[PDB]
Amino acid sequence: GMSNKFLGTWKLVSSENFDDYMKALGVGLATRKLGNLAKGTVIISKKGDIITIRTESTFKNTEISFKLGQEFEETTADNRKTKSIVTLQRGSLNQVQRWDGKETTIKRKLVNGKMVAECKMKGVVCTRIYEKV
Amino acid sequence: GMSNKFLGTWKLVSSENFDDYMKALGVGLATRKLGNLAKGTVIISKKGDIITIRTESTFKNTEISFKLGQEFEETTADNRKTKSIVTLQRGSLNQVQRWDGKETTIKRKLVNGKMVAECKMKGVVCTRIYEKV
Ligand SMILES: CCCCCCCCCCCCCCCC(=O)O
Ligand SMILES: CCCCCCCCCCCCCCCC(=O)O
């Protein structure tokens, strides 16, 4: 299952191409400006077979709870209403979000103790690195 | 989770566009001829959180065991070696198979007591209906 190494609290330490990724999602300028400035915190916990990923920032907080491979409704930070599925590939935690015929993916994997989130939307790619606290 | 209504033994009663689907997978003629003639039987069982789908025919038998949303290695009836994931969407059991940069999906759902499998490969679509025994 999901490695317990994911469990814990994660602090953003780097972000690459987040602006263009947001633009591709349809996020407006003023919103992107605050989205880029946000030094977020991601918290991953588990109770039974149910995994929770909570994102905390000044601007917006989010939280999703899910079982692996079981679709669920999500309200994203920019307030898209998606049908989302989280799966496990080579230890990589892969979230896909579908809405209005569109699709984006957020892949989270552990690299040398850091969590590396890679976001993909229409060939636009961003990378965000977190370190555990 | 996966509805217990899937559990049981299923007999093929109809198949539509299976030939073109096989062609799209790269299946050769003589193999397709036996693949089309095959009156298969699908058996779905569960032990804990692990689901097993066994396909039985004279020509070829197959069997896969998996957890929802967790990638696993599969050897298909035509002997492709794929990385596969099974997920749950609106009660639909969705298998995706990836190999050599390619992708195909087999979606299984229950309709009025029948199991309806829809296979997709490069816009080629097939439908196979099963009734429970
Ligand atoms: C601090 C959160 C973003 C606030 C601004 C809204 C931007 C909309 C896009 C939301 C999806 C962001 C996904 C980031 C993935 C991650 O690093 O966990
Ligand atoms: C009786 C099985 C097929 C035998 C011939 C090999 C054809 C290769 C394609 C294998 C995938 C078939 C998927 C069918 C889905 C189903 O109805 O469960």
mmCIF file of all heavy atoms in Angstrom, chain B residues 13-63:
data_model
loop_
_atom_site.group_PDB
_atom_site.id
_atom_site.type_symbol
_atom_site.label_atom_id
_atom_site.label_comp_id
_atom_site.label_asym_id
_atom_site.label_seq_id
_atom_site.Cartn_x
_atom_site.Cartn_y
_atom_site.Cartn_z
ATOM 1 N N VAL B 13 -22.672 -14.033 -23.417
ATOM 2 C CA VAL B 13 -23.907 -14.227 -24.171
ATOM 3 C C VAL B 13 -23.937 -13.372 -25.441
ATOM 4 O O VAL B 13 -24.744 -13.613 -26.338
ATOM 5 C CB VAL B 13 -25.147 -13.897 -23.309
ATOM 6 C CG1 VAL B 13 -25.218 -14.830 -22.109
ATOM 7 C CG2 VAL B 13 -25.123 -12.441 -22.859
ATOM 8 N N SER B 14 -23.059 -12.377 -25.509
ATOM 9 C CA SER B 14 -22.974 -11.509 -26.680
ATOM 10 C C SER B 14 -21.605 -10.843 -26.788
ATOM 11 O O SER B 14 -20.966 -10.544 -25.779
ATOM 12 C CB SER B 14 -24.068 -10.440 -26.632
ATOM 13 O OG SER B 14 -23.737 -9.333 -27.454
ATOM 14 N N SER B 15 -21.165 -10.618 -28.022
ATOM 15 C CA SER B 15 -19.904 -9.932 -28.287
ATOM 16 C C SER B 15 -20.020 -9.103 -29.561
ATOM 17 O O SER B 15 -20.494 -9.590 -30.587
ATOM 18 C CB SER B 15 -18.756 -10.935 -28.406
ATOM 19 O OG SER B 15 -17.526 -10.275 -28.646
ATOM 20 N N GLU B 16 -19.577 -7.852 -29.484
ATOM 21 C CA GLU B 16 -19.731 -6.903 -30.581
ATOM 22 C C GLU B 16 -18.417 -6.185 -30.878
ATOM 23 O O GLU B 16 -17.870 -5.497 -30.018
ATOM 24 C CB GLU B 16 -20.834 -5.893 -30.242
ATOM 25 C CG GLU B 16 -21.026 -4.779 -31.268
ATOM 26 C CD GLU B 16 -20.264 -3.501 -30.929
ATOM 27 O OE1 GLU B 16 -20.087 -3.191 -29.730
ATOM 28 O OE2 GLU B 16 -19.852 -2.792 -31.873
ATOM 29 N N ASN B 17 -17.920 -6.367 -32.099
ATOM 30 C CA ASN B 17 -16.702 -5.711 -32.578
ATOM 31 C C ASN B 17 -15.435 -6.202 -31.873
ATOM 32 O O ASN B 17 -14.477 -5.446 -31.706
ATOM 33 C CB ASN B 17 -16.820 -4.192 -32.417
ATOM 34 C CG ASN B 17 -16.066 -3.429 -33.495
ATOM 35 O OD1 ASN B 17 -16.040 -3.832 -34.659
ATOM 36 N ND2 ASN B 17 -15.448 -2.319 -33.112
ATOM 37 N N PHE B 18 -15.424 -7.470 -31.479
ATOM 38 C CA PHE B 18 -14.271 -8.035 -30.783
ATOM 39 C C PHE B 18 -13.091 -8.218 -31.732
ATOM 40 O O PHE B 18 -11.936 -8.095 -31.328
ATOM 41 C CB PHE B 18 -14.635 -9.372 -30.135
ATOM 42 C CG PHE B 18 -13.606 -9.873 -29.155
ATOM 43 C CD1 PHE B 18 -13.106 -9.038 -28.170
ATOM 44 C CD2 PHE B 18 -13.149 -11.181 -29.210
ATOM 45 C CE1 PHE B 18 -12.164 -9.488 -27.267
ATOM 46 C CE2 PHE B 18 -12.207 -11.639 -28.305
ATOM 47 C CZ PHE B 18 -11.716 -10.790 -27.332
ATOM 48 N N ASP B 19 -13.388 -8.508 -32.995
ATOM 49 C CA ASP B 19 -12.348 -8.727 -33.993
ATOM 50 C C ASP B 19 -11.500 -7.476 -34.202
ATOM 51 O O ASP B 19 -10.271 -7.530 -34.126
ATOM 52 C CB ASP B 19 -12.961 -9.157 -35.326
ATOM 53 C CG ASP B 19 -11.917 -9.645 -36.313
ATOM 54 O OD1 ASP B 19 -11.107 -10.519 -35.939
ATOM 55 O OD2 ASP B 19 -11.894 -9.143 -37.456
ATOM 56 N N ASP B 20 -12.161 -6.355 -34.475
ATOM 57 C CA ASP B 20 -11.463 -5.097 -34.714
ATOM 58 C C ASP B 20 -10.686 -4.644 -33.482
ATOM 59 O O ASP B 20 -9.625 -4.030 -33.604
ATOM 60 C CB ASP B 20 -12.453 -4.008 -35.137
ATOM 61 C CG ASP B 20 -13.008 -4.234 -36.530
ATOM 62 O OD1 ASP B 20 -12.328 -4.885 -37.349
ATOM 63 O OD2 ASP B 20 -14.127 -3.754 -36.811
ATOM 64 N N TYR B 21 -11.215 -4.945 -32.301
ATOM 65 C CA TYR B 21 -10.523 -4.621 -31.060
ATOM 66 C C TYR B 21 -9.223 -5.410 -30.962
ATOM 67 O O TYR B 21 -8.182 -4.866 -30.592
ATOM 68 C CB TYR B 21 -11.410 -4.912 -29.849
ATOM 69 C CG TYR B 21 -10.685 -4.764 -28.532
ATOM 70 C CD1 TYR B 21 -10.247 -3.522 -28.097
ATOM 71 C CD2 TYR B 21 -10.434 -5.867 -27.724
ATOM 72 C CE1 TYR B 21 -9.580 -3.379 -26.897
ATOM 73 C CE2 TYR B 21 -9.770 -5.734 -26.521
ATOM 74 C CZ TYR B 21 -9.342 -4.488 -26.114
ATOM 75 O OH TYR B 21 -8.677 -4.351 -24.917
ATOM 76 N N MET B 22 -9.290 -6.694 -31.298
ATOM 77 C CA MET B 22 -8.111 -7.553 -31.275
ATOM 78 C C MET B 22 -7.081 -7.091 -32.302
ATOM 79 O O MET B 22 -5.888 -7.033 -32.007
ATOM 80 C CB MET B 22 -8.502 -9.010 -31.538
ATOM 81 C CG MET B 22 -9.112 -9.715 -30.339
ATOM 82 S SD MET B 22 -9.345 -11.482 -30.618
ATOM 83 C CE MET B 22 -10.514 -11.473 -31.973
ATOM 84 N N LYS B 23 -7.545 -6.774 -33.508
ATOM 85 C CA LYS B 23 -6.678 -6.233 -34.552
ATOM 86 C C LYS B 23 -5.915 -5.014 -34.045
ATOM 87 O O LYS B 23 -4.724 -4.861 -34.310
ATOM 88 C CB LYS B 23 -7.495 -5.856 -35.791
ATOM 89 C CG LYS B 23 -7.998 -7.047 -36.584
ATOM 90 C CD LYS B 23 -9.035 -6.651 -37.622
ATOM 91 C CE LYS B 23 -8.424 -5.836 -38.746
ATOM 92 N NZ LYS B 23 -9.015 -6.203 -40.064
ATOM 93 N N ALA B 24 -6.612 -4.159 -33.305
ATOM 94 C CA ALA B 24 -6.028 -2.926 -32.790
ATOM 95 C C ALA B 24 -4.977 -3.219 -31.723
ATOM 96 O O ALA B 24 -4.067 -2.418 -31.509
ATOM 97 C CB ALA B 24 -7.117 -2.022 -32.232
ATOM 98 N N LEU B 25 -5.104 -4.368 -31.063
ATOM 99 C CA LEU B 25 -4.123 -4.793 -30.066
ATOM 100 C C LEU B 25 -2.891 -5.408 -30.730
ATOM 101 O O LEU B 25 -1.849 -5.570 -30.095
ATOM 102 C CB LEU B 25 -4.738 -5.801 -29.090
ATOM 103 C CG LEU B 25 -5.836 -5.308 -28.143
ATOM 104 C CD1 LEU B 25 -6.423 -6.488 -27.390
ATOM 105 C CD2 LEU B 25 -5.311 -4.260 -27.172
ATOM 106 N N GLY B 26 -3.020 -5.754 -32.010
ATOM 107 C CA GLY B 26 -1.931 -6.352 -32.764
ATOM 108 C C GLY B 26 -2.040 -7.864 -32.847
ATOM 109 O O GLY B 26 -1.069 -8.548 -33.174
ATOM 110 N N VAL B 27 -3.223 -8.387 -32.546
ATOM 111 C CA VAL B 27 -3.467 -9.824 -32.585
ATOM 112 C C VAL B 27 -3.542 -10.314 -34.027
ATOM 113 O O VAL B 27 -4.230 -9.721 -34.856
ATOM 114 C CB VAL B 27 -4.772 -10.193 -31.845
ATOM 115 C CG1 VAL B 27 -5.008 -11.700 -31.872
ATOM 116 C CG2 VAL B 27 -4.730 -9.683 -30.415
ATOM 117 N N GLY B 28 -2.835 -11.402 -34.317
ATOM 118 C CA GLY B 28 -2.784 -11.950 -35.660
ATOM 119 C C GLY B 28 -4.046 -12.707 -36.030
ATOM 120 O O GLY B 28 -4.839 -13.064 -35.160
ATOM 121 N N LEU B 29 -4.220 -12.966 -37.323
ATOM 122 C CA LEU B 29 -5.465 -13.521 -37.853
ATOM 123 C C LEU B 29 -5.898 -14.831 -37.201
ATOM 124 O O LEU B 29 -6.985 -14.912 -36.628
ATOM 125 C CB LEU B 29 -5.338 -13.742 -39.363
ATOM 126 C CG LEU B 29 -6.571 -14.318 -40.067
ATOM 127 C CD1 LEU B 29 -7.825 -13.526 -39.724
ATOM 128 C CD2 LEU B 29 -6.354 -14.336 -41.571
ATOM 129 N N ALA B 30 -5.055 -15.853 -37.310
ATOM 130 C CA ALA B 30 -5.375 -17.179 -36.789
ATOM 131 C C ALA B 30 -5.744 -17.118 -35.311
ATOM 132 O O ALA B 30 -6.585 -17.880 -34.837
ATOM 133 C CB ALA B 30 -4.203 -18.127 -37.002
ATOM 134 N N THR B 31 -5.109 -16.202 -34.589
ATOM 135 C CA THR B 31 -5.377 -16.029 -33.168
ATOM 136 C C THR B 31 -6.736 -15.369 -32.951
ATOM 137 O O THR B 31 -7.479 -15.740 -32.042
ATOM 138 C CB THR B 31 -4.285 -15.179 -32.492
ATOM 139 O OG1 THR B 31 -2.990 -15.676 -32.856
ATOM 140 C CG2 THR B 31 -4.436 -15.219 -30.983
ATOM 141 N N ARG B 32 -7.053 -14.383 -33.786
ATOM 142 C CA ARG B 32 -8.343 -13.706 -33.720
ATOM 143 C C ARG B 32 -9.494 -14.656 -34.040
ATOM 144 O O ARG B 32 -10.574 -14.555 -33.458
ATOM 145 C CB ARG B 32 -8.380 -12.520 -34.684
ATOM 146 C CG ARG B 32 -7.498 -11.349 -34.291
ATOM 147 C CD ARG B 32 -7.955 -10.078 -34.981
ATOM 148 N NE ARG B 32 -8.147 -10.270 -36.418
ATOM 149 C CZ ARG B 32 -7.203 -10.099 -37.339
ATOM 150 N NH1 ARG B 32 -5.976 -9.729 -36.995
ATOM 151 N NH2 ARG B 32 -7.490 -10.297 -38.619
ATOM 152 N N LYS B 33 -9.261 -15.571 -34.974
ATOM 153 C CA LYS B 33 -10.282 -16.533 -35.377
ATOM 154 C C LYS B 33 -10.707 -17.422 -34.211
ATOM 155 O O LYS B 33 -11.883 -17.747 -34.067
ATOM 156 C CB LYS B 33 -9.773 -17.399 -36.528
ATOM 157 C CG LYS B 33 -9.823 -16.718 -37.884
ATOM 158 C CD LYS B 33 -9.025 -17.501 -38.913
ATOM 159 C CE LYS B 33 -9.347 -17.061 -40.328
ATOM 160 N NZ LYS B 33 -9.448 -18.230 -41.245
ATOM 161 N N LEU B 34 -9.743 -17.811 -33.382
ATOM 162 C CA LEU B 34 -10.025 -18.628 -32.208
ATOM 163 C C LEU B 34 -10.523 -17.760 -31.055
ATOM 164 O O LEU B 34 -11.288 -18.216 -30.206
ATOM 165 C CB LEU B 34 -8.776 -19.408 -31.786
ATOM 166 C CG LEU B 34 -8.251 -20.421 -32.806
ATOM 167 C CD1 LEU B 34 -6.918 -21.000 -32.354
ATOM 168 C CD2 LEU B 34 -9.264 -21.533 -33.034
ATOM 169 N N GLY B 35 -10.082 -16.506 -31.036
ATOM 170 C CA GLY B 35 -10.509 -15.559 -30.023
ATOM 171 C C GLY B 35 -11.976 -15.201 -30.161
ATOM 172 O O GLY B 35 -12.670 -14.998 -29.166
ATOM 173 N N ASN B 36 -12.445 -15.121 -31.401
ATOM 174 C CA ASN B 36 -13.837 -14.792 -31.679
ATOM 175 C C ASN B 36 -14.770 -15.970 -31.412
ATOM 176 O O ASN B 36 -15.905 -15.787 -30.973
ATOM 177 C CB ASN B 36 -13.991 -14.326 -33.128
ATOM 178 C CG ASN B 36 -13.709 -12.844 -33.297
ATOM 179 O OD1 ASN B 36 -14.278 -12.009 -32.594
ATOM 180 N ND2 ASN B 36 -12.823 -12.511 -34.228
ATOM 181 N N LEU B 37 -14.286 -17.180 -31.674
ATOM 182 C CA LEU B 37 -15.085 -18.387 -31.485
ATOM 183 C C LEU B 37 -15.236 -18.737 -30.009
ATOM 184 O O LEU B 37 -16.192 -19.408 -29.618
ATOM 185 C CB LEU B 37 -14.452 -19.564 -32.229
ATOM 186 C CG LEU B 37 -14.513 -19.516 -33.757
ATOM 187 C CD1 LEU B 37 -13.592 -20.569 -34.350
ATOM 188 C CD2 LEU B 37 -15.937 -19.715 -34.251
ATOM 189 N N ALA B 38 -14.290 -18.279 -29.195
ATOM 190 C CA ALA B 38 -14.267 -18.607 -27.773
ATOM 191 C C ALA B 38 -15.510 -18.108 -27.040
ATOM 192 O O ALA B 38 -15.762 -16.905 -26.978
ATOM 193 C CB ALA B 38 -13.018 -18.029 -27.126
ATOM 194 N N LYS B 39 -16.280 -19.045 -26.493
ATOM 195 C CA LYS B 39 -17.383 -18.717 -25.597
ATOM 196 C C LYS B 39 -16.852 -18.726 -24.165
ATOM 197 O O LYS B 39 -16.845 -19.762 -23.503
ATOM 198 C CB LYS B 39 -18.537 -19.711 -25.743
ATOM 199 C CG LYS B 39 -18.969 -20.002 -27.173
ATOM 200 C CD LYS B 39 -19.701 -21.331 -27.229
ATOM 201 C CE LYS B 39 -20.318 -21.594 -28.590
ATOM 202 N NZ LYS B 39 -20.935 -22.948 -28.654
ATOM 203 N N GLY B 40 -16.406 -17.569 -23.691
ATOM 204 C CA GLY B 40 -15.678 -17.492 -22.438
ATOM 205 C C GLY B 40 -16.533 -17.517 -21.186
ATOM 206 O O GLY B 40 -17.758 -17.392 -21.241
ATOM 207 N N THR B 41 -15.861 -17.693 -20.052
ATOM 208 C CA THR B 41 -16.480 -17.614 -18.735
ATOM 209 C C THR B 41 -15.599 -16.759 -17.834
ATOM 210 O O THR B 41 -14.405 -17.026 -17.698
ATOM 211 C CB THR B 41 -16.667 -19.009 -18.098
ATOM 212 O OG1 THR B 41 -17.646 -19.750 -18.836
ATOM 213 C CG2 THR B 41 -17.119 -18.892 -16.641
ATOM 214 N N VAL B 42 -16.186 -15.733 -17.223
ATOM 215 C CA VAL B 42 -15.447 -14.866 -16.315
ATOM 216 C C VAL B 42 -15.898 -15.124 -14.883
ATOM 217 O O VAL B 42 -17.095 -15.163 -14.594
ATOM 218 C CB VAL B 42 -15.632 -13.375 -16.666
ATOM 219 C CG1 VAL B 42 -14.934 -12.491 -15.636
ATOM 220 C CG2 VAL B 42 -15.096 -13.088 -18.059
ATOM 221 N N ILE B 43 -14.923 -15.302 -13.996
ATOM 222 C CA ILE B 43 -15.186 -15.564 -12.587
ATOM 223 C C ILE B 43 -14.557 -14.470 -11.738
ATOM 224 O O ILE B 43 -13.348 -14.251 -11.792
ATOM 225 C CB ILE B 43 -14.638 -16.938 -12.151
ATOM 226 C CG1 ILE B 43 -15.185 -18.042 -13.057
ATOM 227 C CG2 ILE B 43 -14.987 -17.223 -10.694
ATOM 228 C CD1 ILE B 43 -14.308 -18.358 -14.257
ATOM 229 N N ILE B 44 -15.390 -13.791 -10.956
ATOM 230 C CA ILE B 44 -14.935 -12.714 -10.088
ATOM 231 C C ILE B 44 -15.099 -13.124 -8.630
ATOM 232 O O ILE B 44 -16.201 -13.445 -8.183
ATOM 233 C CB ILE B 44 -15.706 -11.406 -10.359
ATOM 234 C CG1 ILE B 44 -15.579 -11.024 -11.837
ATOM 235 C CG2 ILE B 44 -15.180 -10.283 -9.472
ATOM 236 C CD1 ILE B 44 -16.432 -9.848 -12.251
ATOM 237 N N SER B 45 -13.989 -13.117 -7.899
ATOM 238 C CA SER B 45 -13.980 -13.493 -6.491
ATOM 239 C C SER B 45 -13.207 -12.466 -5.678
ATOM 240 O O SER B 45 -12.535 -11.597 -6.237
ATOM 241 C CB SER B 45 -13.365 -14.882 -6.310
ATOM 242 O OG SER B 45 -12.089 -14.957 -6.925
ATOM 243 N N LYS B 46 -13.302 -12.572 -4.356
ATOM 244 C CA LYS B 46 -12.637 -11.637 -3.462
ATOM 245 C C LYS B 46 -12.222 -12.325 -2.169
ATOM 246 O O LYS B 46 -12.994 -13.078 -1.575
ATOM 247 C CB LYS B 46 -13.553 -10.449 -3.156
ATOM 248 C CG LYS B 46 -12.907 -9.351 -2.323
ATOM 249 C CD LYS B 46 -13.934 -8.333 -1.850
ATOM 250 C CE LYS B 46 -13.496 -6.912 -2.162
ATOM 251 N NZ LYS B 46 -14.365 -5.909 -1.487
ATOM 252 N N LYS B 47 -10.989 -12.062 -1.750
ATOM 253 C CA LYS B 47 -10.470 -12.536 -0.473
ATOM 254 C C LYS B 47 -9.789 -11.375 0.238
ATOM 255 O O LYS B 47 -8.664 -11.007 -0.096
ATOM 256 C CB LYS B 47 -9.491 -13.694 -0.677
ATOM 257 C CG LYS B 47 -10.153 -15.057 -0.842
ATOM 258 C CD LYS B 47 -9.213 -16.033 -1.548
ATOM 259 C CE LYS B 47 -9.223 -17.425 -0.926
ATOM 260 N NZ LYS B 47 -10.141 -18.364 -1.631
ATOM 261 N N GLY B 48 -10.480 -10.797 1.214
ATOM 262 C CA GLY B 48 -10.009 -9.587 1.862
ATOM 263 C C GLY B 48 -10.210 -8.397 0.947
ATOM 264 O O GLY B 48 -11.299 -8.200 0.407
ATOM 265 N N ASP B 49 -9.156 -7.607 0.766
ATOM 266 C CA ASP B 49 -9.201 -6.451 -0.124
ATOM 267 C C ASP B 49 -8.663 -6.794 -1.509
ATOM 268 O O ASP B 49 -8.538 -5.918 -2.366
ATOM 269 C CB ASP B 49 -8.399 -5.292 0.471
ATOM 270 C CG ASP B 49 -6.939 -5.646 0.692
ATOM 271 O OD1 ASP B 49 -6.630 -6.852 0.811
ATOM 272 O OD2 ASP B 49 -6.103 -4.720 0.750
ATOM 273 N N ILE B 50 -8.352 -8.070 -1.725
ATOM 274 C CA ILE B 50 -7.767 -8.517 -2.985
ATOM 275 C C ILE B 50 -8.822 -9.169 -3.871
ATOM 276 O O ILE B 50 -9.432 -10.174 -3.500
ATOM 277 C CB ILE B 50 -6.603 -9.499 -2.744
ATOM 278 C CG1 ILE B 50 -5.519 -8.806 -1.909
ATOM 279 C CG2 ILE B 50 -6.040 -10.008 -4.077
ATOM 280 C CD1 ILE B 50 -4.269 -9.634 -1.665
ATOM 281 N N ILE B 51 -9.016 -8.585 -5.048
ATOM 282 C CA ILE B 51 -10.000 -9.059 -6.012
ATOM 283 C C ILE B 51 -9.317 -9.886 -7.091
ATOM 284 O O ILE B 51 -8.230 -9.536 -7.548
ATOM 285 C CB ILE B 51 -10.750 -7.884 -6.669
ATOM 286 C CG1 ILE B 51 -11.429 -7.030 -5.596
ATOM 287 C CG2 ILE B 51 -11.772 -8.397 -7.686
ATOM 288 C CD1 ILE B 51 -12.019 -5.741 -6.115
ATOM 289 N N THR B 52 -9.963 -10.976 -7.496
ATOM 290 C CA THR B 52 -9.450 -11.824 -8.564
ATOM 291 C C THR B 52 -10.469 -11.946 -9.691
ATOM 292 O O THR B 52 -11.643 -12.217 -9.447
ATOM 293 C CB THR B 52 -9.095 -13.234 -8.050
ATOM 294 O OG1 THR B 52 -8.161 -13.131 -6.970
ATOM 295 C CG2 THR B 52 -8.487 -14.080 -9.167
ATOM 296 N N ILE B 53 -10.005 -11.740 -10.921
ATOM 297 C CA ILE B 53 -10.830 -11.939 -12.108
ATOM 298 C C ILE B 53 -10.198 -13.013 -12.980
ATOM 299 O O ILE B 53 -9.118 -12.813 -13.538
ATOM 300 C CB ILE B 53 -10.998 -10.637 -12.923
ATOM 301 C CG1 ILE B 53 -11.674 -9.565 -12.062
ATOM 302 C CG2 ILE B 53 -11.802 -10.902 -14.202
ATOM 303 C CD1 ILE B 53 -11.941 -8.255 -12.785
ATOM 304 N N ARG B 54 -10.877 -14.151 -13.086
ATOM 305 C CA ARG B 54 -10.399 -15.266 -13.893
ATOM 306 C C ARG B 54 -11.242 -15.433 -15.150
ATOM 307 O O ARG B 54 -12.464 -15.552 -15.074
ATOM 308 C CB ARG B 54 -10.411 -16.566 -13.088
ATOM 309 C CG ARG B 54 -10.029 -17.775 -13.916
ATOM 310 C CD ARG B 54 -9.785 -19.008 -13.070
ATOM 311 N NE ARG B 54 -9.356 -20.132 -13.902
ATOM 312 C CZ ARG B 54 -8.111 -20.314 -14.333
ATOM 313 N NH1 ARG B 54 -7.154 -19.451 -14.012
ATOM 314 N NH2 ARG B 54 -7.819 -21.365 -15.087
ATOM 315 N N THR B 55 -10.576 -15.450 -16.302
ATOM 316 C CA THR B 55 -11.237 -15.693 -17.578
ATOM 317 C C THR B 55 -10.898 -17.095 -18.064
ATOM 318 O O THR B 55 -9.725 -17.462 -18.141
ATOM 319 C CB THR B 55 -10.815 -14.666 -18.643
ATOM 320 O OG1 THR B 55 -10.943 -13.342 -18.113
ATOM 321 C CG2 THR B 55 -11.672 -14.801 -19.893
ATOM 322 N N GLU B 56 -11.928 -17.871 -18.388
ATOM 323 C CA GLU B 56 -11.748 -19.251 -18.828
ATOM 324 C C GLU B 56 -12.335 -19.491 -20.212
ATOM 325 O O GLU B 56 -13.509 -19.213 -20.464
ATOM 326 C CB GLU B 56 -12.383 -20.218 -17.826
ATOM 327 C CG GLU B 56 -11.493 -20.545 -16.640
ATOM 328 C CD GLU B 56 -12.208 -21.352 -15.576
ATOM 329 O OE1 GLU B 56 -13.306 -21.877 -15.860
ATOM 330 O OE2 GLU B 56 -11.674 -21.459 -14.454
ATOM 331 N N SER B 57 -11.499 -20.005 -21.107
ATOM 332 C CA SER B 57 -11.937 -20.438 -22.426
ATOM 333 C C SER B 57 -11.107 -21.646 -22.840
ATOM 334 O O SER B 57 -10.084 -21.940 -22.223
ATOM 335 C CB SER B 57 -11.794 -19.312 -23.453
ATOM 336 O OG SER B 57 -10.451 -19.176 -23.886
ATOM 337 N N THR B 58 -11.552 -22.349 -23.875
ATOM 338 C CA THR B 58 -10.801 -23.482 -24.396
ATOM 339 C C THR B 58 -9.429 -23.023 -24.878
ATOM 340 O O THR B 58 -8.407 -23.635 -24.563
ATOM 341 C CB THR B 58 -11.548 -24.168 -25.558
ATOM 342 O OG1 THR B 58 -12.695 -24.859 -25.051
ATOM 343 C CG2 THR B 58 -10.640 -25.161 -26.282
ATOM 344 N N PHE B 59 -9.423 -21.933 -25.637
ATOM 345 C CA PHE B 59 -8.211 -21.429 -26.270
ATOM 346 C C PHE B 59 -7.188 -20.941 -25.249
ATOM 347 O O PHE B 59 -6.044 -21.398 -25.239
ATOM 348 C CB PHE B 59 -8.563 -20.299 -27.240
ATOM 349 C CG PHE B 59 -7.386 -19.763 -28.005
ATOM 350 C CD1 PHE B 59 -6.408 -20.616 -28.484
ATOM 351 C CD2 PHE B 59 -7.265 -18.407 -28.258
ATOM 352 C CE1 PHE B 59 -5.326 -20.127 -29.189
ATOM 353 C CE2 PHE B 59 -6.185 -17.915 -28.965
ATOM 354 C CZ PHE B 59 -5.216 -18.777 -29.431
ATOM 355 N N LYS B 60 -7.604 -20.012 -24.394
ATOM 356 C CA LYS B 60 -6.717 -19.424 -23.392
ATOM 357 C C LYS B 60 -7.446 -19.151 -22.083
ATOM 358 O O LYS B 60 -8.577 -18.667 -22.085
ATOM 359 C CB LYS B 60 -6.110 -18.116 -23.912
ATOM 360 C CG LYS B 60 -5.105 -18.269 -25.045
ATOM 361 C CD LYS B 60 -3.727 -18.651 -24.530
ATOM 362 C CE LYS B 60 -2.723 -18.730 -25.669
ATOM 363 N NZ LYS B 60 -1.532 -19.549 -25.314
ATOM 364 N N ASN B 61 -6.790 -19.468 -20.970
ATOM 365 C CA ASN B 61 -7.244 -19.038 -19.651
ATOM 366 C C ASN B 61 -6.354 -17.916 -19.146
ATOM 367 O O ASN B 61 -5.154 -17.902 -19.415
ATOM 368 C CB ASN B 61 -7.227 -20.196 -18.651
ATOM 369 C CG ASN B 61 -8.079 -21.365 -19.094
ATOM 370 O OD1 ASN B 61 -9.122 -21.185 -19.719
ATOM 371 N ND2 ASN B 61 -7.638 -22.575 -18.769
ATOM 372 N N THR B 62 -6.945 -16.974 -18.419
ATOM 373 C CA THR B 62 -6.176 -15.925 -17.762
ATOM 374 C C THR B 62 -6.707 -15.717 -16.356
ATOM 375 O O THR B 62 -7.791 -16.186 -16.013
ATOM 376 C CB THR B 62 -6.232 -14.586 -18.529
ATOM 377 O OG1 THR B 62 -7.557 -14.043 -18.463
ATOM 378 C CG2 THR B 62 -5.829 -14.776 -19.984
ATOM 379 N N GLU B 63 -5.932 -15.008 -15.546
ATOM 380 C CA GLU B 63 -6.328 -14.697 -14.183
ATOM 381 C C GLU B 63 -5.469 -13.567 -13.654
ATOM 382 O O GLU B 63 -4.249 -13.583 -13.801
ATOM 383 C CB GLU B 63 -6.204 -15.928 -13.282
ATOM 384 C CG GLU B 63 -6.606 -15.673 -11.837
ATOM 385 C CD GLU B 63 -6.447 -16.900 -10.964
ATOM 386 O OE1 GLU B 63 -6.879 -17.992 -11.388
ATOM 387 O OE2 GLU B 63 -5.884 -16.773 -9.856
#
